[PDB]
Amino acid sequence: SPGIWQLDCTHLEGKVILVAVHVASGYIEAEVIPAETGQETAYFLLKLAGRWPVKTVHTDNGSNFTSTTVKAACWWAGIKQESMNKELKKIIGQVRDQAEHLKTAVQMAVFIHNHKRGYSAGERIVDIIATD
Amino acid sequence: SPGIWQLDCTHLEGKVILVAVHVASGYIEAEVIPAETGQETAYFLLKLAGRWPVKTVHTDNGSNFTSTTVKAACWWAGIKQESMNKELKKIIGQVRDQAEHLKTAVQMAVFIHNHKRGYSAGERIVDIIATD
Ligand SMILES: Cc1nc2c(c(C)c(C)n2Cc2cnn(C)c2)c(-c2ccc(Cl)cc2)c1[C@H](OC(C)(C)C)C(=O)O
Ligand SMILES: Cc1nc2c(c(C)c(C)n2Cc2cnn(C)c2)c(-c2ccc(Cl)cc2)c1[C@H](OC(C)(C)C)C(=O)O
Structure with a gap:
């Protein structure tokens, strides 16, 4: 289904990477966040929903979505509740030397992956959303 | 042309909003950045290029792109060099009370606008990119 996204956090260099995967296509949005908090998840969800038709959201850690602030972001954006972190970490390691900050390397790995x-x-996420 | 984006900064509440407009469709990506620096523009460009086929970039302030760090981001992403800030500020003011932080309201206005x-x-940006 074109509106299904999976959201998770992974860890690297003592930092947290929030990874959102459009399941139907494998397309990735990812950001380095200062802490693994509900506020950062809520804000990331608001950003994502403004850029893509986010209908339902899955996760591998259901307690990610118990935050009062996360439920409000989902409420506001009309979101309901519905490997790749190894592939992203692999690309990050390949391009890790090309940048000082981990957040820069993450965006490089996102670029390469997508x-x-x-x-x-x-290419196939815009096709999936277009046909639908 | 489907790969043309316009990037600019606007000011609100003593803060800087970087606004990227997909010219062919009017679709907006926007973020609150701590300062109007070349590093923030370079990082934003890397993020944008990983999410959309960014071929050429326009701006209303050409000195935005003179940074050595900005030219490197463009170089790496294959980017060449090629109102809405009033409409975004208008929507921001409408939803400004719905949130404490300006950055939250910006994402709300981006959601609403897109x-x-x-x-x-x-809808029409994914169609433009799909047909092309
Ligand atoms: C922090 C930083 N400084 C930079 C650059 C660049 C190219 C230069 C020249 N400088 C100044 C410098 C470096 N060494 N010296 C002695 C001075 C980059 C960069 C790396 C890769 C890409 Cl594609 C684009 C920019 C970054 C990146 O951060 C962002 C947030 C992306 C700007 C990062 O994380 O590496
Ligand atoms: C800072 C912040 N705290 C929040 C919320 C919410 C809903 C609650 C309950 N709290 C705790 C609170 C508020 N008052 N009290 C006494 C306790 C939100 C929010 C606002 C709008 C949406 Cl759609 C989603 C979340 C935000 C937003 O920040 C982000 C970065 C988005 C989390 C913002 O900028 O308002």
Whole structure:
């Protein structure tokens, strides 16, 4: 289904990477957040929902979504409740030297992942959303 | 052309909002940045390029792109060099009370703008990129 996203946090260099995967296409949005808090998840959800038709959200840690602030963001954006962290960490390690900050390398790995091809993840998400 | 984005900063509450507009569709990405620096523009460009096919970038302030760090981000993402800030500020003011932080209100205004309809800005950008 075109509106299903999976959201999770992973850890690297003592920092937290919030990874959102459009399940139907494998397309990734990811950001380095200062702490693994409900406020950061709520804000990230608001950002994501403004850029993509986010209908339902899955996670591998259901307690991520128990926050009063997270439920309000979902409420406001009309969101209901519905590996890749290894692939993203692999690309991060490949490009890790190309940048000082981990957050820069994360965006590089997101770029590479979404455009790597026989279409790419970025190519088939816009097709999925367009046809639907 | 589907790869043309316009990037600018605007000011509100002593803070800086970086606004990127997909010119062909009117679709907006916007973030609150701590300062109007080349590093923040470079990082924002890296984020944008990983999510959309960014080919060329325009701006209303050409000195935004003179930074050595900005030119490197463009170089790495394959980017070449090619109102709405009033409409975004208007929506921000409408939803300004719904949130404490300006950055939250910005994302709300982005959400509203991209999904307001007779298609919406978010709808026609994915169509433009899909057909192309
Ligand atoms: C912190 C930083 N400083 C930078 C650059 C660059 C290219 C230069 C010249 N400088 C100044 C410098 C470096 N060494 N010296 C002695 C001076 C980059 C960078 C790295 C890769 C890309 Cl594609 C684009 C920019 C970054 C990146 O941070 C962002 C937030 C992305 C700006 C990062 O995380 O590496
Ligand atoms: C800072 C903040 N705290 C919040 C919320 C909510 C809903 C609650 C309950 N709290 C705790 C609270 C508030 N008052 N009291 C006494 C305790 C929100 C919020 C506002 C709008 C949406 Cl859709 C979603 C969340 C935010 C937003 O920040 C982000 C970064 C988005 C979390 C913001 O900028 O308002």
